Design a protein around this ligand. Structure first.
Ligand SMILES: Nc1ncnc2c1ncn2[C@@H]1O[C@H](COP(=O)(O)OP(=O)(O)O)[C@@H](O)[C@H]1O
Ligand SMILES: Nc1ncnc2c1ncn2[C@@H]1O[C@H](COP(=O)(O)OP(=O)(O)O)[C@@H](O)[C@H]1O
Lengths: 732, 58, 46
């Protein structure tokens, strides 16, 4: 019940807080009682509880000033408890801020403190902040000294003196703007994990004792630089009751030989002295590299001493040591073992919403106009780490100032107020920042013309499992992962593979047999294993094997001596695909120019079970191919693509692409003539002229003879005659 | 798996690494049955072409 | 130079084929091949 949501106070002063009647009853509390408030950044205060109906059950009506004292904002969670044994204060010493005391001709105590604390009966704590209105400037007071410590009620007979050294404005501001868990963005999950491995053992060590475990004494943070590991150290420093101490890797290296070890030993001694304690080690890889590869023996000494003191604690001191590294591999491998920095956390690059949060955090102090939208900037900056985002914000503010360099004058002793109030950041500044700062196939189904059945089948095999995983899990059948494309050359099999990869948004890897065949003994099979491993790394992926006939042949019969090695290659592929049954996301598509010699074992169901015959495009598909090729080129209306498709009976898709290439080349040539004519006029046709089609087609010939095509039909008819279960109906 | 690749009739392919395949076969022969105490190592082979496998392997 | 010395298809011509296919994306670099006799060079080059 102690948790409550920070809520505004309508009339309550700083030394009083308000609760709802049901909530105040729930705590077994009386009206006017002294209460203790705990808020973020380990900020503790004491106030007087009040009854109010407007105050919500889950909200506490409480002011701005104590919010600053508690370092909390609206909506923040603070823990409220009864405060017992709140003795009346004998004497309080308060240090006001430097800014507030300026211009106050009269004494602060007489003008402000004396009437404020007359019959106050207010309980206060060391470091408590309160505000008093009056004079030319409202005055802030901070209670540095309390007597008796720590909780003291200000009675009228209590003497109050503001004499001493007033608190500097920057010193109070730094604590006010000090970091907590909210200031770090994009790693809330990692903050929760770090709380679990670190904060949880410290708050409840007996809980770890009961279950028969020893808490992880040391934890490691690794990832790209700038992700905020030191910032996480700052946050855990501010918001943990456990005593926090600093060890800096550069600071460790700064000491003389034989003094870094002394500093670290006294560090662990101090940590084990206080109960509890947390140590953080930034740049652990800097002072703890591998002892196998080390330039100086002193570094080996410091690594060994760190190991010895790491084993020195016996899990009873309850001190957790934290380490941050940009390169975890540089850290000595011993530290990664058990009983020591075994627990690793990777602070990956922030996502879109995380980087949005980081941008908001970085820009909260800066002014933001109505036009600026941080979500857009986050959308464009895919890869910037948090430090890059901070630099982006700073250079956006720099553009804001730069746009006024014509208005402002540096030589002046003072700056203009008009330009200053006109000065702010706009969208253009963040655009410049985005431009300056530095952190799948193109082919689509619309590009392909014809072969609609093949397109639908490819969508069925690959796109549907990722679209509908639940349906596949329900029917309990693993999706097929094998497609073979066989047909005459230049019919868009590679286009089909690229299109399906683009539609499914998976990495596309394409390779051919001669790329793999090589000359050394085991090299080709190693290449096959490497390409399959590469497909695994880029999962989900579409692995495309072009010229499958060259790489896969009938093992039983091969004329050449080296064909035996070729046999070996095929075997490797077989085994690889047995490993590819595990990776359902990796989809293997094999296009072969001639499928008769393809090994029967590779076409076995479970490796390449789908066989697709890609024939020559018909008249309709030829029209579609001409449309696709002529999308980019404006064309005259006189040409009839239907007639072109009808005439080009023996041509493939590549033939038509070369056709359009030559046609538009002669279009360039007539453009040369037109521009020469324009130059003569100094001293145009919108679309392609028809005689260019006339001449361009003459250059083209038939790519593939019909005999190979009838061979393809013979293979397809063997496949069809094999599928002889058409006359199949279950009994009754 | 696919033992017929690593195991062949010795001398079948002259250009298979200059006898490196035959040396591999001899090494496998010594490692399966040689002058070492047999451990609890059960060797399973799978092949589609058993007639090409070395008779000493079988 | 002397592309005919290499020369229907083999490993090296396939490497160069894939490289020029990927290289067509970069228009700025200009690819020139001078061979003495073009009859024997692979038509995929053409
Ligand atoms: N998630 C985040 N939220 C807010 N600021 C961040 C975040 N990540 C990084 N930063 C900023 O970027 C900097 C990252 O530095 P850091 O990675 O801690 O240095 P090192 O790697 O040397 O310890 C910090 O100063 C911090 O202000
Ligand atoms: N249906 C089609 N639509 C558009 N272009 C096509 C089509 N079929 C083939 N092509 C053209 O043929 C050329 C080569 O095709 P390719 O992908 O090499 O076929 P294959 O997979 O048979 O080798 C491509 O540049 C492409 O422009």
């Amino acid at each position: 019940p102690n948790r409550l949501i920070v809520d505004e106070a309508i009339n309550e002063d700083n030394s009083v807080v308000s609760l709802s009647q049901p909530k105040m009853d729930e705590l077994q509390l009386f009206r006017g009682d002294t209460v203790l408030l705990k808020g973020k950044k380990r900020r503790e205060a004491v106030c007087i509880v009040l009854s109010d109906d407007t105050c919500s059950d889950e909200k506490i009506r409480m002011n701005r000033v104590v919010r600053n004292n508690l370092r909390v904002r609206l909506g923040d969670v603070i823990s409220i408890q009864p405060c017992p044994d709140v003795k009346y204060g004998k004497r309080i010493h308060v240090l006001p801020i430097d800014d507030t005391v300026e211009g106050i001709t009269g004494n602060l105590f007489e003008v402000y403190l004396k009437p404020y604390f007359l019959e106050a009966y207010r309980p206060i704590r060391k470091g408590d902040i309160f505000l008093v209105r009056g004079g030319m400037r409202a005055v802030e007071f901070k209670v540095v000294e309390t007597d008796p410590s720590p909780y003291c009620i200000v009675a009228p007979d209590t003497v109050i003196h503001c004499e001493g050294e007033p608190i500097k404005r920057e010193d109070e501001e730094e604590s006010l703007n000090e970091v907590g868990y909210d200031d770090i963005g994009g790693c809330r999950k990692q903050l929760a994990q770090i709380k679990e491995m670190v904060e949880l053992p410290l708050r409840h060590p007996a809980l770890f004792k009961e279950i028969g475990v020893k808490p992880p004494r040391g934890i490691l943070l690794y990832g790209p630089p700038g992700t905020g590991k030191t910032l996480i150290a700052r946050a855990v420093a501010n918001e943990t009751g456990a005593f926090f101490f600093l060890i800096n890797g550069p600071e460790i290296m700064s000491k003389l030989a034989g003094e870094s070890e002394s500093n670290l030993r006294k560090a662990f001694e101090e940590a084990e002295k206080n109960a509890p304690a947390i140590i953080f080690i930034d740049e652990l890889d800097a002072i703890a590299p591998k002892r196998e590869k080390t330039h100086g023996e002193v570094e080996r000494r410091i690594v060994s001493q760190l190991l010895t003191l790491m084993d020195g604690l016996k899990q009873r001191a309850h001190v957790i040591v934290m380490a941050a590294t940009n390169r975890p591999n540089s850290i000595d491998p011993a530290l990664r073992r058990f009983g020591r920095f075994d627990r690793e956390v990777d602070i990956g690059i922030p996502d879109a919403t995380g980087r949005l949060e980081i941008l908001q955090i970085h820009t909260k102090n800066m002014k933001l106009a109505d036009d600026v939208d941080l979500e857009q900037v986050a959308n464009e900056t895919h890869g910037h780490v948090g430090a890059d985002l901070a630099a982006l914000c700073s250079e956006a503010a720099l553009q804001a100032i730069r746009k006024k360099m014509d208005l402002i004058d540096l030589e002046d002793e003072t700056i203009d107020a008009e330009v200053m109030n006109s000065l702010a950041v706009t969208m253009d500044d963040f655009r410049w920042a985005l431009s300056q700062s530095n952190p799948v196939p193109q082919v689509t189904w619309e590009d392909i013309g014809g072969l609609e059945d093949v397109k639908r089948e490819l969508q069925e095999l690959v796109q549907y499992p990722v679209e509908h995983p639940d349906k596949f899990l329900k029917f309990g059948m693993t999706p097929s992962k094998g497609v073979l494309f066989y047909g005459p050359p230049g019919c868009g099999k590679t286009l089909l593979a690229k299109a399906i990869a683009n539609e499914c948004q998976a990495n596309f890897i394409s390779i051919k047999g001669p790329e793999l065949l090589t000359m050394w003994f085991g090299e080709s099979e190693a290449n096959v294993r490497e390409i399959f491993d590469k497909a695994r790394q880029a999962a989900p992926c579409v692995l495309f094997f072009d010229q499958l006939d060259s790489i896969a042949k009938a093992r039983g019969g091969n004329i050449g001596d080296g064909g035996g090695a070729a046999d070996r290659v095929i075997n490797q592929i077989l085994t690889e695909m047995d490993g590819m049954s595990t990776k359902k996301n990796v989809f293997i598509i094999g296009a072969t120019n001639r499928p008769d010699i393809i090994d029967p074992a590779i076409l076995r169901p479970g490796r390449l079970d789908q066989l697709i015959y890609i024939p020559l495009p018909d008249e309709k598909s030829r029209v579609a191919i001409l449309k696709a090729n002529l999308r980019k080129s404006p064309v005259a209306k006189d040409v009839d693509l239907e007639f072109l498709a009808k005439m080009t009976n023996g041509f493939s898709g590549a033939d038509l692409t070369e056709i359009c290439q030559r046609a538009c080349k002669l279009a360039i040539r007539e453009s040369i003539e037109s521009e020469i004519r324009r130059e003569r006029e100094r001293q145009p046709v919108p679309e392609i002229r028809r005689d260019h089609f006339e001449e361009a087609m003459r250059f083209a010939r038939r790519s593939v003879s019909d005999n190979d095509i009838r061979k393809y039909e013979m293979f397809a008819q063997t496949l069809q005659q094999s599928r002889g279960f058409g006359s199949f109906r279950f009994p009754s």
